Amino acid sequence: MERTFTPNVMQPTPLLPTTNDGRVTFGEAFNDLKDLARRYQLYWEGTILEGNLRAIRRNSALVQLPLYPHGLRIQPDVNNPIWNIMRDGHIPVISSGFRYFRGGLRLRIVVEGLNSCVWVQHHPDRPSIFSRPIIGRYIAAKDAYRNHAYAAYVQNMSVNRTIEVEVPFYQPGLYGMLNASDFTGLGDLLIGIEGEQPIPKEGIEISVYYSIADDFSFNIFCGFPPMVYCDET
Amino acid sequence: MERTFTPNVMQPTPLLPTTNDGRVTFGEAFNDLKDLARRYQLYWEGTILEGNLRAIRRNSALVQLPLYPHGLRIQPDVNNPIWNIMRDGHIPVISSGFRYFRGGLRLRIVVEGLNSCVWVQHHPDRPSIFSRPIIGRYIAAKDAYRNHAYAAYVQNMSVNRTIEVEVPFYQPGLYGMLNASDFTGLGDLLIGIEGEQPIPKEGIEISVYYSIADDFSFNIFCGFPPMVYCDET
Amino acid sequence: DNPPDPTPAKFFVPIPSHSWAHGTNTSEPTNTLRLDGGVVGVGRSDDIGTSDTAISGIIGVYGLLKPFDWNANDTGRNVGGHLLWSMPVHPQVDKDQVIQVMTQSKLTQYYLPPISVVSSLYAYTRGSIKYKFLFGNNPRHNARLLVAYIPGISSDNRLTLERARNSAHVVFSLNEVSEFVFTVPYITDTMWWPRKYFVAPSYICMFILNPLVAMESVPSIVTIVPMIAAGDDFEVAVPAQPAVGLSRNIDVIY
Amino acid sequence: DNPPDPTPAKFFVPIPSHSWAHGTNTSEPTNTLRLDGGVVGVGRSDDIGTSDTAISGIIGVYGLLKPFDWNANDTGRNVGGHLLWSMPVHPQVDKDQVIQVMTQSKLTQYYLPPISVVSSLYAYTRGSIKYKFLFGNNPRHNARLLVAYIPGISSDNRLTLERARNSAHVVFSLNEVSEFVFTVPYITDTMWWPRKYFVAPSYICMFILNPLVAMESVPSIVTIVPMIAAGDDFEVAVPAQPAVGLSRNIDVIY
């Protein structure tokens, strides 16, 4: 096989004795990228103001966020300097090397400001038109309010501030496509308020973090794209 | 039997191989409407103001809500655009195909605003005159305050905001009637405050969600009524 | 004795309620309103059957579609090759072949077959469909029809009889036969096909092969009633926003 | 009966969520959005392999480094001892021997071999590296090269051929041989060596031993393509801030 082929090997010394992937000196074995990809990382972080929401703005969406196992497309503005100096996370970088996937994501949505009953809902097949989220008044007529019978979840920001949910993989096809260009992905995730708590005069600060589920798998290893060093920022 | 009767079948190909109702490709089997009908959906969502409540308004009803396994009658006003563009839920649609039922509902009452000790109570036989709820001052003399010895429940909106209760099926008859016209149904559900916390100058926003219990069953399948497509709104 | 219990305090993550999505294969902590406490349910007998909601039994029942006519005395439309009727094949029947009741300023009410209501409750669906055609005629009429199933076609633009005979089809002769079922295959590049209310995966069409005959003693019009039910292998997939609401209240705010 | 349950109330310490760091060897309480409730996963078969992410398989693949020329007709640089190519040895290849694509005001895009992407995801790393050199030539060229591995050197300041022959090295003769792999040892006072993007633990260099020959009938330039993959014993250590981002969006705010 041409990728791993090694002709005429000239090796001066023996090979180095093994630590069982670090289990000898540390306690754990770092043998796999799928375990590194299950440590949570930031996904999208935004603010939402009154007045760029709906007119009536009782139980409505605040964000429809597209679920991609690679990241959303990043733009490194001056508001969140994360996306600027840290570039992408470890998950978009691991993901850019594989072609397909099959499996779900885990999310952690931390929506505060607001401190009322907030809700989340997964539309497994309404994909996949764009690489940004859509805020408030710009989400389309039929993604505006909650729907009936889509898998959803509800939480009082008074009891607890963090919603942690796991999105299933519901698709007709064999794979979902990593590195899509722009029914390929995991569909949409809608986040929204449950009935018109008055909004603080600055912001509802939402931030989504994500990871890989347990049954998730990266599937066909082609190359990595060209990278950019973070220390050059 | 004339409903399923198939005379002179001409079939060009073999039948398609089975996925065990989706269990091959997804993880779960969607073989039954009774399982879809146990995912919660919205039931009634309203607001209640001071001044359309009682005169003395210490521990009183705020709503007497009639328990129907089909929905309440919907009216699609501009306040909650849910009932407008989403029409009914999956439960009123599943229910319109069956004639009877026998079993209870599960509810989730999220009453906030107010943040004081709120209470719920089931009147298994005081049915069933109307398809709307009745707010505040309009509930009748003997459904006004709490009663003694009806199954009831109490909760501080300070500790937790969500009351989840399960209503039993208490009737003399064999069945309860789905698709009633207007002792047929599950009786009444009364929701009320426990002693005159001052009410915020706008609203106590109550919303009830419901589902089917475990012992619940739809019973005689006749047709479905004529429907209306939601995408035409 | 009052011995001390020093065992460390465990962590725990507070949440306001249980799962809103789960419908099966689990328990649900809840506060029941009973005098009893315990896992209790309402009694049953044979007077009250079991729940009838198993999907395959609901979707096995035929619903009815818009009927249509041959006019055997029509010299124009009664010929070799003229196509009578056709429609894309998917469980939700196309809005124009359903019986509708239209109101001014209200919503249009469609009569959907039981397969079309069930398929509106789910996001994907697959498997064969049965089309039972039901002819109003008597022993004196006669004809032959070719009913073909074209995979991967949206509309009839390029569709003629001479082409339709190149796909799966059935030739039926209505000579003292009043009903026949045509179980259309399911041929698609994917395993589940998404709902429609999109394009349908395939198409179905019905051509006159031998035109209709009849006499001076017999009615010249033959009415056909198409009816549709799910096959034996038909399956639905992921619960979604129902495409249809009830008509109990048809008022709508644009 | 309603007996009282007087058992003492245990302590418990509230926290908003579960572990943000843990990725393996544990369960994760979570609210899944399924109709089902239970430990459930998406189906698989052979159509869909297992996950391919096991590190040793990803890092076994060669990535390519900047190629470079002998000019056999060059009388200056083609001599006994002239050193062709060299670089510090560590998994992240040095920024100047990678193929770069530079843009005005944007970030520079580097093509990193698969070992160099993996090694950017971890904080420490150790084990041997393979350097496969690939010569564009035909049976008529000939030369010998000495490729030495100098432990504990940063740059070539004090490096000559007469010194490089005192370390581990391999003498290779390109006489109808087009590829050879040089598995460099790993010699370091410590067990794990930290990432670079620091100094590299060692250095590698390649001297002409017998100069290149060729004729009037054959091209005089021989291009060499260096390629790098991890050895059999190579291992990574502690997940860290990735040294590299993706180039999907290369805009940067200074």
Automatic annotation (TrEMBL), chains A, B:
Cleavable signal peptide: none
Subcellular localization, as worded in the UniProt entry: Host cytoplasm; Host membrane; Virion
Protein name per its UniProtKB record: Genome polyprotein
